[PDB]
Design a protein around this ligand. Structure first.
Ligand SMILES: NC(=O)[C@H](CCC(=O)O)NC(=O)[C@H](CCC(=O)O)NC(=O)[C@@H](CC(=O)NO)Cc1cc(-c2ccc(-c3cccc(Cl)c3)cc2)no1
Ligand SMILES: [Ca+2]
Ligand SMILES: [Ca+2]
Ligand SMILES: [Ca+2]
Ligand SMILES: [Zn+2]
Ligand SMILES: [Zn+2]
Length: 159
């Protein structure tokens, strides 16, 4: 019962890239994270490099221009705004973390799946198996799957 996008074609743009990973790996992680949600909804996501994207993906540090300042290494890893114009939908990742493609540091893909959930209108789950649970936990990314609770949540918003 949070806000939803009132359309099924949603664009995203990667505003900037963490130096922790190569650009191609950031692109891949974000694309795959969007795919997780498109797989179970009518939503389609297209990356754009120019224009006005709905969801802006940002890596930033500390106080970074909104009311949700980061806290340095550890603690909060990322945050995102629910659907709406402007900053609505945007997903922000704390550059003070060490973003990775793997089990070391903080896995970008898994964190992005969680944040994009918020960008689409989901809140937190109390189900410890849900990607929308409030605390990060590395799982085998090649066997990762949305929980039934996550699928219930997103299908209740779209479709
Ligand atoms: N406490 C911890 O274990 C870590 C430690 C961080 C560190 O020191 O490096 N920190 C967090 O988990 C923080 C705690 C923040 C707080 O409440 O104080 N959580 C986050 O930063 C969240 C913040 C948030 O909710 N943003 O919207 C970000 C977050 C949530 C996840 C997510 C990913 C996968 C899963 C998961 C769980 C079970 C199964 C599966 Cl398949 C996946 C569920 C959650 N990824 O990013
Ligand atoms: Ca936006
Ligand atoms: Ca932090
Ligand atoms: Ca970093
Ligand atoms: Zn922010
Ligand atoms: Zn969250």
């Amino acid at each position: 019962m949070g806000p939803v996008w009132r359309k099924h074609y949603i664009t995203y743009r990667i505003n900037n890239y963490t130096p922790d990973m190569n650009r191609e790996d950031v692109d891949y992680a974000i694309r795959k994270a969007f795919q997780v949600w498109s797989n179970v909804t009518p939503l389609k996501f297209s990356k754009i490099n120019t224009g006005m994207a709905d969801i802006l993906v940002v890596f930033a540090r500390g106080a970074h221009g909104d009311d949700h300042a980061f806290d340095g290494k550890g603690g909060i890893l990322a945050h995102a705004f629910g659907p709406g114009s402007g900053i609505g939908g945007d997903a922000h990742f704390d550059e003070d973390e060490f973003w990775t493609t793997h089990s070391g540091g903080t896995n970008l893909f898994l964190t992005a799946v969680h944040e994009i959930g918020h960008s689409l209108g989901l809140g937190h789950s109390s189900d410890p198996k849900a990607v929308m649970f409030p605390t990060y936990k590395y799982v085998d990314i090649n066997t990762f799957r949305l929980s039934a609770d996550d699928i219930r949540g997103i299908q209740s918003l779209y479709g």
